[PDB]
Design a protein around this ligand. Structure first.
Ligand SMILES: C/C1=C\[C@H](C)C[C@H](C)OC(=O)C[C@H](c2ccc(O)cc2)NC(=O)[C@@H](Cc2c(Br)[nH]c3ccccc23)N(C)C(=O)[C@H](C)NC(=O)[C@@H](C)C1
Ligand SMILES: C/C1=C\[C@H](C)C[C@H](C)OC(=O)C[C@H](c2ccc(O)cc2)NC(=O)[C@@H](Cc2c(Br)[nH]c3ccccc23)N(C)C(=O)[C@H](C)NC(=O)[C@@H](C)C1
Ligand SMILES: C/C1=C\[C@H](C)C[C@H](C)OC(=O)C[C@H](c2ccc(O)cc2)NC(=O)[C@@H](Cc2c(Br)[nH]c3ccccc23)N(C)C(=O)[C@H](C)NC(=O)[C@@H](C)C1
Ligand SMILES: Nc1ncnc2c1ncn2[C@@H]1O[C@H](COP(=O)(O)OP(=O)(O)O)[C@@H](O)[C@H]1O
Ligand SMILES: Nc1ncnc2c1ncn2[C@@H]1O[C@H](COP(=O)(O)OP(=O)(O)O)[C@@H](O)[C@H]1O
Ligand SMILES: Nc1ncnc2c1ncn2[C@@H]1O[C@H](COP(=O)(O)OP(=O)(O)O)[C@@H](O)[C@H]1O
Ligand SMILES: [Mg+2]
Ligand SMILES: [Mg+2]
Ligand SMILES: [Mg+2]
Lengths: 371, 371, 371
């Protein structure tokens, strides 16, 4: 019949059906355990909570993420997140529907092999595939040529694609992160005397940056003017109706993506990583990549991100280049939309790995590479 | 001439002169008010008492601490504690001597700015500086490389330092506390029927843990043997000569530092916080940090603390590491000794903020960071 | 008196005195700057570190190489590397001794002119010369005829020489590299989940390939057998005593020299480049070149390199040729030894450019070509 399309990352699950316009389930990739006691098992409160249940009952729980930096670090909790995805949120038996699954570009091979083993053995699925976030993100724009830049909760990566050919050699990946921006915002907020210690408070700091942070177009002038004018300062009201006021932290937090030395990394910013990835491509490609830069995933969504990115790339590139950066408003769903398209496309249908073909071939078969 | 060095925390003041071997004044950071009546102002008993006066006349007073978790929460009483430090205990006019002042690593900026404003305006001081407890604590050992772990009345923090470079990114701070161990010991003592309600009784429970508590090397075996044998049980005699007998509470109280879930926090223990802070450092540094772990402040002083800390770190680290933990007996004065050294060091002498330079620059100047 | 002989490349400096058997100083061509802060200049830790200092204090620094692909890309750091060579490591005043200097075969002319200008103006040297790595490498073997193949950190080049005549027309150069093998090994290691991001980790991956990599004699059979048998898998212990296990990556990395399509280049391998360079020589020479193939520089030093090189050339050449490939164990020092010999040789002594002769002639004189 029809095929499930699943995009699961360090910050969310996005799952649904091929050919829908948007995901049906979006929920945090979180499992929570009772913190203050071992369970009153005879009365039988749930021993664990997943997604929006764990976000509702936040304060009593400790919130774990099964996926660190795009790598599944706890399989016991990742089987809970897939079970909760299929049975509770989609209301689907996975026995009927093939599934489409997603990874970051450069990733331990066992992270794919164990995911495949679990999806055939603990769940039963007619056929499966694993796809790259950047390829799907490009199909979501419909373009055949461009350099995708994709930044999620756990990873930032770049993949150049030219005329529908794809280049393994110029892939770049950073572990600079949405999380790695949250953890910086916790520290920088501490400068005002707001201390956010627990993981449940970390979810408050995440929501604070999602509402309030933006990319300063010119950082040094906005730092200068924020000291002089309180006009930048803006208010947030906590779950218990206390109130918070935030100043230069508001733009200073997204600055870490352009200057990771703030968090303390050796890295190029996302702009210098994009320019260096373009320059590693052959000189004929480079004009056509400068004509397309494409942004996907939530960390891209800060206000003014593309205006700064263009302002900094224009200063690096030769001045005779047209430099163009592309954002739909839909960017956070772009990878899932690309997977929906690819799964629906009849041309794809031979690429599914059949369970029998896995059974004879053994786990290595998943790594076979296809366009 | 010579420079005052002041280390003031949630549990004590340690003050004295640069180049002395130890503080000259040590007294509780306490202000006490008459509890049972308003003063007979015409007869004119003192309306407030500070430090050892308030500890001598304990029962009639209510004892307040101006500093909560390293943050000065009452300035009216903190000006009383500085006035009582300089005029009554040191017998010094602060008009002549520059002063050196100390904070926890991550702290509201206004807590430093208001302290500086008060020290120039309400008291007159030729020059001032603010220093970090971990840096001073490392100078007190003389080492150039190590991970300091410093635990006071109000805060626990870690700062890695390598070859005299210092790393802002890997600082960690807990609000687990000497106080937060006292308040647990009050509860755990209640299990035997000794109820300590008032702040004056809280000072008795503090002195009980200071005399009697120790860190159980292996907790579960000592819990098992304490139930069987009364040999662990030991006697304390109260101010009025009544007597108290205390069993497994004696080690169970310091266990909270290793397992803060006892008090009810989400935290790593001090061992897992130290190991995680080492692991956030680059792999070359990590061997040299494992070779040095340094302990400062009174909460470190429980018997067997370092033997347990080493036993638990050795189980976390790769087994080929030499793991070394360092305690002088002097640890409670270590921060003050480090400040004495730093103030005496001629290299430092340009780092003082002159009152005129503050007057022109305004309060922000205090945050400039220096070695 | 006596003459300094200097061989400086993208991966090392090899320097010493003419007529010695080996270099006196060998140290990385690295300059390191404090990464976590700008220096605390008043306390005055060194603002930069060079060679083995930068390798000792690796974790706190960011490591730059001044030379990319045999071209000096940062002169500010290259003057630091020459200063550290003469004053700190050799303990020599360059005012007294003439120096002998080395380049890759085809290289920007300004790279020679600026080096000469610096060596007369910022350092004072009685006379200078620039020499080709392949010529020196051949003098180190003492042969008069052969095709040298020289592979360093940054460049691979070939020069045919016949009866002590040298042929400009058949020089070939590749930017396939020791570095370009390290950067591939970082990626291929990522397949096992070991991520090496920083330049200090890049030095660990360099040391991993230097200890563990080897040239697979037949690649496809060893790929087949490595999957079946764990016997190839071998262990490496990190700076912090963690352990690493490496399988088919161990030979797959040196395979890139034979098949640069792995890294993604259009190139012949070193074998097909050598065969094509021989074939560009006149048919009488070609037998005498097949009788001598000579290997110099560290990238040549992988185990089994010559056995594979001979096995692949023997399959290309006419079967009636004796095909002979020559490796001392000393190959990494071979260029320096050849320069030591050439500088000591009295016949050479007229070829030095005197400082006065440079002063009158102007910079172009350096390019005059001499045997
Ligand atoms: C409701 C919240 C905050 C507050 C009640 C909201 C109000 C509005 O903030 C203030 O401005 C008040 C004040 C404060 C006090 C002095 C000052 O010069 C500036 C601020 N600061 C505080 O009460 C600090 C003190 C503190 C602890 Br201990 N360690 C810390 C580590 C670093 C910094 C500061 C601290 N404090 C106890 C908290 O944040 C607690 C843990 N925070 C929360 O539970 C979350 C859910 C947010
Ligand atoms: C766009 C192009 C050139 C450049 C960017 C255009 C600019 C304008 O040329 C310069 O003048 C800059 C600079 C340079 C550096 C120092 C110097 O005293 C003179 C020039 N030289 C370089 O970046 C060299 C260095 C180099 C490699 Br590795 N091996 C080589 C072998 C021989 C010579 C030099 C080299 N370099 C990396 C390239 O050429 C690359 C491969 N070239 C190209 O992709 C083509 C399509 C043309
Ligand atoms: C000491 C070292 C490695 C390790 C601790 C040594 C141990 C022995 O390796 C493992 O086998 C464990 C594990 C792992 C987890 C799951 C799995 O199916 C296989 C391995 N992988 C990891 O912890 C990865 C995860 C990762 C980050 Br984030 N981005 C990445 C990009 C690509 C791939 C993987 C990753 N990780 C955090 C690291 O490597 C860190 C950055 N590495 C280092 O600091 C250097 C100095 C080497
Ligand atoms: N509107 C927004 N503005 C700013 N940041 C956002 C926004 N929406 C999500 N984010 C951040 O982006 C990350 C989630 O991105 P996403 O691509 O959904 O992650 P994943 O790829 O794991 O699903 C989180 O760090 C979240 O805080
Ligand atoms: N010998 C000891 N044994 C156990 N606890 C102690 C000892 N000495 C001090 N303490 C406790 O440690 C805290 C004082 O630590 P200290 O570092 O002096 O605080 P501060 O940093 O405020 O000066 C108090 O809670 C005190 O009860
Ligand atoms: N024993 C070895 N085995 C494998 N590779 C080596 C060995 N020794 C050095 N190398 C590599 O060769 C390069 C150094 O070669 P070298 O000729 O000394 O460079 P340079 O010409 O710059 O001095 C580096 O990439 C180093 O990793
Ligand atoms: Mg994503
Ligand atoms: Mg202290
Ligand atoms: Mg060389």
């Amino acid at each position: 019949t029809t095929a499930l399309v699943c995009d699961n990352g360090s910050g969310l699950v996005k799952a649904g059906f091929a050919g829908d316009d948007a995901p049906r389930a979006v929920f945090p990739s979180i499992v929570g355990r009772p913190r203050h006691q071992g369970v009153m098992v005879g009365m039988g409160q749930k021993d664990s909570y997943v997604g929006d249940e764990a976000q509702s009952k936040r304060g009593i729980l400790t919130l774990k993420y099964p996926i660190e930096h795009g790598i599944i670090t706890n399989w016991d909790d990742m089987e809970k997140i897939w079970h909760h995805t299929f049975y509770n949120e989609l209301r689907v038996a996975p026995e009927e529907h093939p599934t489409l699954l997603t990874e970051a570009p450069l990733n331990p091979k066992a992270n794919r092999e164990k995911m495949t083993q679990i999806m055939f053995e603990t769940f039963n699925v007619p056929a499966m595939y694993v796809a790259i976030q950047a390829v799907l993100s490009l199909y979501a724009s419909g373009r055949t040529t461009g350099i995708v830049l994709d930044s999620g909760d756990g990873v930032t990566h770049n993949v150049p694609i030219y005329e529908g050919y794809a280049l393994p050699h110029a892939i770049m990946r950073l572990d600079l992160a949405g999380r790695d921006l949250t953890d910086y915002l916790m520290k920088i907020l501490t400068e005002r005397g707001y201390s956010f210690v627990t993981t449940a408070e970390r979810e408050i700091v995440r929501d604070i940056k999602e509402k309030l942070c933006y990319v300063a177009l010119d950082f040094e002038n906005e730092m200068a003017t924020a000291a002089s004018s309180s006009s930048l300062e803006k208010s947030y009201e906590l779950p218990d109706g206390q109130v918070i006021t935030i100043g230069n932290e508001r733009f200073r937090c997204p600055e870490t993506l352009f200057q990771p030395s703030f968090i303390g990394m050796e890295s190029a910013g996302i702009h210098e990583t994009t320019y260096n990835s373009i320059m590693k491509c052959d000189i004929d490609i480079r004009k056509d990549l400068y004509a397309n830069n494409v942004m996907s995933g939530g960390t891209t969504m800060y206000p003014g991100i593309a205006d700064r990115m263009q302002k900094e790339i224009t200063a690096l590139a030769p001045s005779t280049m047209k430099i163009k950066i592309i954002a739909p408003p839909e960017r956070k769903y772009s990878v899932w939309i690309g997977g929906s398209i690819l799964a629906s496309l009849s041309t794809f249908q031979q690429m599914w790995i059949t369970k029998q073909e896995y059974d004879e071939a053994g786990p290595s078969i998943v790594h076979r590479k296809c366009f």
